[PDB]
């Protein structure tokens, strides 16, 4: 019924190593559409990368990546793949698997981040922010992590209203961001407000209860 596509296989690789990205599609006939990969840098325009036909005998690439990228598909499992040769620092972007209609792309996935740097993974640190009325606000600080991204939720994600996740700032190979939530004064500290932070690369999962 519904069309759903999810990317996976991204992260951090060294400048000169290989990496293969995967993308699982469901909800439509995977063996009847042309597939394509489209990446986008941090705050830049979209850039078409590759394209594959139904069976796999015709593959279109860009004049830049001459034999560096290799797109493939598996119709038995309805999966799309993108194998990459030793990468460079100019390939750091977020890759989307799209349903190419010989031209426009009518469906886009979530997208995975691919980072090509010579840095090492670093574990984050979650710090609660206690007040120091009418509508109280609380904070949750995630300091010193690498690389992007992270996931911040409140009470298993059932606090979407009044939430504010702020863009991180890069400080010499170390990111850090903060989240802000607003709840009525009758709920806190009457109820336990929990901040959930997740970091995929470092396999970090921290749940902190905000207390005065």
């Amino acid at each position: 019924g519904q069309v759903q596509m999810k990317e996976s296989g991204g992260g951090l690789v060294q400048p000169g190593k290989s990496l293969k990205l995967s993308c699982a599609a469901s909800g439509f006939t995977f063996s009847d559409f042309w597939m394509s990969w489209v990446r986008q840098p941090s705050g830049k325009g979209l850039e078409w990368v590759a394209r594959i036909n139904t069976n796999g005998d015709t593959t279109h690439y860009t004049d830049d990546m001459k034999g560096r990228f290799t797109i493939s598909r598996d119709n038995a499992k309805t999966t799309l793949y993108l194998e990459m040769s030793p990468l460079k620092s100019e390939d750091t972007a977020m890759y989307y698997c799209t349903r190419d209609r010989l031209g426009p792309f009518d469906y886009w996935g979530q997208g995975t981040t691919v980072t090509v740097s010579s840095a090492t993974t670093k574990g984050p640190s979650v710090y609660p922010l206690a007040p120091g009325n009418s509508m109280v606000t609380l904070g949750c600080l995630v300091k010193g992590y690498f690389p992007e991204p992270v996931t911040v939720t409140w009470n298993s994600g059932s606090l979407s209203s009044g939430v504010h996740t702020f863009p991180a700032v890069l400080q010499s190979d170390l990111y850090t961001l903060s989240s802000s939530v607003t709840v009525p004064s009758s709920t806190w500290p009457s109820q336990t407000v929990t901040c959930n932070v997740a970091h995929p690369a470092s396999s970090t999962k921290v749940d902190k209860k905000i207390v005065p």
């Binding site: 640190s125 609660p128 206690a130 120091g132 607003t182």
Partner: peptide, 14 residues
């Protein structure tokens, strides 16, 4: 809607 937050005890350990 301005608000200020002091450093936490967990951060002081760092």
């Amino acid at each position: 809607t301005v608000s200020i937050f002091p450093p936490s005890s967990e951060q002081l350990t760092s």
